[PDB]
Amino acid sequence: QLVESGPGLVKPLETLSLTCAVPGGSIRRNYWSWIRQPPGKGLEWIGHSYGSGGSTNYNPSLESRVTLSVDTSKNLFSLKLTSVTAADTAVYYCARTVWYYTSGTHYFDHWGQGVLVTVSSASTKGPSVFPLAPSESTAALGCLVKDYFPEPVTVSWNSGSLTSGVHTFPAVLQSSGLYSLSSVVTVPSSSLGTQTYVCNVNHKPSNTKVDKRVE
Amino acid sequence: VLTQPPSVSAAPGQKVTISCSGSSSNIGRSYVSWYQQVPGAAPKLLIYDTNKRPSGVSDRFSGSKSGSSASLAITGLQTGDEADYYCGAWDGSLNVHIFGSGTKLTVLGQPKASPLVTLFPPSSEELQANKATLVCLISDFYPGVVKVAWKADGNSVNTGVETTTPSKQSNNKYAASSYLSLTSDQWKSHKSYSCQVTHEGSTVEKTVAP
């Protein structure tokens, strides 16, 4: 059993402190690692420590920022990560590490459930809204809803009267900490000059409501 | 870097292999481990010491390595196997654990479907504000894995690109989007931009011009 505990939220350039609890002992005679995973991305090993070393071995790409430690009497394995940025937003896992230098075998046989840590420079901000305009049977038009925080936003078309062929895409999160999304309606090609299309955008956290004609 | 194919897939009942290609400083001298991460759980150890199974891992999973490259094989594919797989090995030069780039295993599903790609130029309105956001929308593709690359005058773009993870649509195909955030001056000073979407080894591109 391994249990991570974290702060949930940390401000940019602050220090992230996590803890991993190892009930049932065995902390002293083992290696222990921190591993993380940004949303939508791959695993990254941060480093390991021995339960009594207290030797440590860190990912060189994070070295100046990382401190691992072991409190044998509280059975706690800890990570400090200084000067965080949005790149450090990830799920953080602790894992028991089997490490035999002699055979070059390093692997993680027991994992915690992991804790999400979110680093955000973003404050509430309302979006800009721009039109997305272009033999095929269909054409696509839409609205770009740019640079808002936080989620969510809603988008309907023609005041809710147009529902068929509507696709609102999940938002992207940019390195700025702000989101953008797009909503597009797929329409018969011949309908292009014979009908009008207005996206109705609502971003409630910023009291933002915009109607935009797309032509 | 341990290089895995982003997407491996086959019908239930079939067999698949997932490659993991390293270098002599890692896979060549080290034992290889594999991890299974069902969505959206923690990873679990599937294979350790290159070919060994922890208790409670089925004999349908099997591992080997040859030189600088490792492989995980799965037989009798079952819907529960659909998941991300990561290989891992110690690198004795860098003194670090290196995870592979990860493979989504898809248990098919429905037929393969190539993405429909729409690339929008920046609007006149955003341009008057001295900005140009290009918007590349990718929909109805299956398996739900794609690589997006942008070109500026045919040149690879390595700055200002942001692309979502793929998300399951109601029809169980997937959607994604990619945004290239520019100033109006960059847009106006190029002759073309393209969004190139690679899915299952084929590429679908769209191009816009100022």
Ligand SMILES: [Cl-]
């Ligand atoms: Cl099984």
Ligand SMILES: [Cl-]
């Ligand atoms: Cl660039």
Ligand SMILES: [Cl-]
């Ligand atoms: Cl259908």
